[PDB]
Amino acid sequence: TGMNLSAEVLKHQPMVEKYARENGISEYVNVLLAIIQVESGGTAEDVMQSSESLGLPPNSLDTESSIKQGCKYFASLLSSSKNQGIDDLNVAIQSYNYGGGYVGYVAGKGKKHTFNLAESFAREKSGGKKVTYTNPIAVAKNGGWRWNYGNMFYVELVNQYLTSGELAQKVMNEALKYQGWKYVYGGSNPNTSFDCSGLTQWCYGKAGISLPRTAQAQYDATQHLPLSQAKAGDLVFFHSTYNAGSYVTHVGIYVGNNQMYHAGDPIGYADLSSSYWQQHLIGAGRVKQ
Ligand SMILES: [Cl-]
Ligand SMILES: [Cl-]
Ligand SMILES: [Cl-]
Ligand SMILES: [Cl-]
């Protein structure tokens, strides 16, 4: 059963892309963000829970050192895999939780990760000791338990977060170039940075849709619909966010699953389920195509 990454995790994406690039694993940014989600939900200082991989006490690293170490550690597990003749990504993902010894274990037993191999490795390392594990995946599989070592369901947990139209894709491919950028009032291009309506105008403009300059003018130019009927690529509008002369004071890009991408300070994803965003929500608007 597939799931969506939280805004708390997604805020770490520019930093994750930086260190993934430095370790030659830019194609695995999605896996690295799924690991953060599973490990800390993006709210712990050590976001990747990579302190133990550096032989340090739990939660010793700061956020930057955590992403640096997590990326470096995951890159070493992929290298260890390649060197032992393993092509399977799931071996590197399970070894993030189990340690590099799971690579060697799998290399001599078929070169592929299987739930049965993950289960046998944990059974050996635990000394045949069980512990309660009430995650619905474990409940449905064996009643709700695991062998007392690492997490034998780790691959499946990470792959829950690794499961939109053409307009949404073009708008977001442009918008994500400015993730973590400082909000600039009156900004409508990459040379000045952007404000909320400046970001939507530029990115939709790159997708071939001509939008007016203001959040209010953008609201007036769209077909309105409630957020419950909205899709990724629709705009989401807000009232009274600051002292302004118009009804609409803020605009964002709806990205589905009750979340948006906006400017935003820094520019990025926001969870719409917070009390604040619910109290300012007008609804959504569909652009003319
Ligand atoms: Cl046993
Ligand atoms: Cl037991
Ligand atoms: Cl803002
Ligand atoms: Cl329009």
TrEMBL record:
Q: Which UniProt keywords apply?
A: Hydrolase, Protease, Thiol protease
Q: Which residues form the NlpC/P60 domain?
A: 165-288
In terms of InterPro entries, this protein maps to:
CwlT-like_lysozyme, Lysozyme-like_dom_sf, NLP_P60_dom, Papain-like_cys_pep_sf, Peptidase_C40
Q: Name one GO molecular function term.
A: cysteine-type peptidase activity
Say yes or no: keyword Transferase present: no
Any one GO biological process: proteolysis
Does the keyword field hold Hydrolase?
Answer: yes
Which family, according to the similarity comment? Belongs to the peptidase C40 family.
Protein name listed in UniProt? Cell wall hydrolase Tn916-like,CTn1-Orf17
Organism in which the protein naturally occurs: Clostridioides difficile (strain 630)
